[PDB]
Ligand binder design. Sequence first.
Ligand code: HEC
Ligand code: HEC
Lengths: 125, 125
Amino acid sequence: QFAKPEDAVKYRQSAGTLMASHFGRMTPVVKGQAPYDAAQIKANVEVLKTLSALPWAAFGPGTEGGDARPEIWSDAASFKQKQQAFQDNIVKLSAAADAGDLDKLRAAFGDVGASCKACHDAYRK
Amino acid sequence: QFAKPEDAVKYRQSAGTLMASHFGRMTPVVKGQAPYDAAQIKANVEVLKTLSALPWAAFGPGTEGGDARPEIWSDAASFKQKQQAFQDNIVKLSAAADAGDLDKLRAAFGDVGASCKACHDAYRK
Ligand code: HEC
Ligand code: HEC
């Protein structure tokens, strides 16, 4: 859906921006510094679920650029393993939120966050 | 969820970027220049549905900036009318996609597009 590689870069960076907001806004809840309203967090994680699937299709043919490392395209299976496992971790976060289980949310949140970081450490300049 | 007004601006502009991609990538389908696969478009409009609800909460207290016109905050009800009617138009687009009805999709797409433009013309610098 991108007329130029620059358009893919703009897309995936905006997806990243929105994920960071929907993920990071829960830090105070996970830490107990903000109250836990199970319904609020269930809805937010649903947003995060939708966004979490979006970046990967914007690293398609010829879309090199931004702060993507070139290792993304030449090691297609290792990068894929990492996005698929990130979204696994997102399913687990969905399950905790949908259950209204804060303990479970805290653990699942940390796993998601570790997955984000692991991919950036390998694949983001 | 924004530590500074700049963070709200970054959020709403990235929401706008992703909406433009999920909306605009259907132009060739609506025009018949790309094939119509009802399942593909149903899924895409579901993404667009989720994104379409996101910008409005990022025009909150003290979040003035970017290319938002100041008229957004002082006329809170007229701006609200416009986002609520845009999302009405999104419901109609969802209905057409969910029905797998291309004629209906074409009409609903044009209505959405008109709603985008109407709000930008009034409220975007
Ligand atoms: C690989 C499987 C990734 C996972 C998992 C996550 N991110 Fe990511 N991110 C990735 C890359 C390769 C890039 C660079 C894209 C480019 O072309 O520049 C990014 C970028 C971001 C950004 C910065 C966007 C910007 O302002 O330019 C953010 C804020 C970001 N990523 C956030 C983020 C979060 C919160 C994630 C887990 C919930 C996450 N990413 C996962 C690769 C990958
Ligand atoms: C008011 C009810 C709006 C509707 C409906 C839509 N948009 Fe919007 N848009 C609006 C404002 C006030 C702004 C400026 C925000 C800022 O602080 O700068 C925007 C911005 C955009 C952008 C540009 C983002 C950027 O690169 O800075 C885009 C691409 C955009 N809007 C797209 C878009 C589309 C495709 C819409 C309908 C599907 C749509 N907007 C609706 C206000 C409103």
